[PDB]
Ligand binder design. Structure first.
Ligand code: NA
Ligand code: NA
Length: 31
């Protein structure tokens, strides 16, 4: 029901968030 659905939301957004960190960091670490 809503329980399943909630877990999709959670997963996706966690994944998304992590990608931004990775990208920003790569850009920075270079200079
Ligand atoms: Na989808
Ligand atoms: Na970013």
């Amino acid at each position: 029901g809503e329980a399943a659905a909630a877990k999709e939301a959670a997963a996706a957004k966690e994944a998304a968030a992590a990608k931004e960190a990775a990208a920003a960091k790569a850009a920075a670490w270079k200079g």
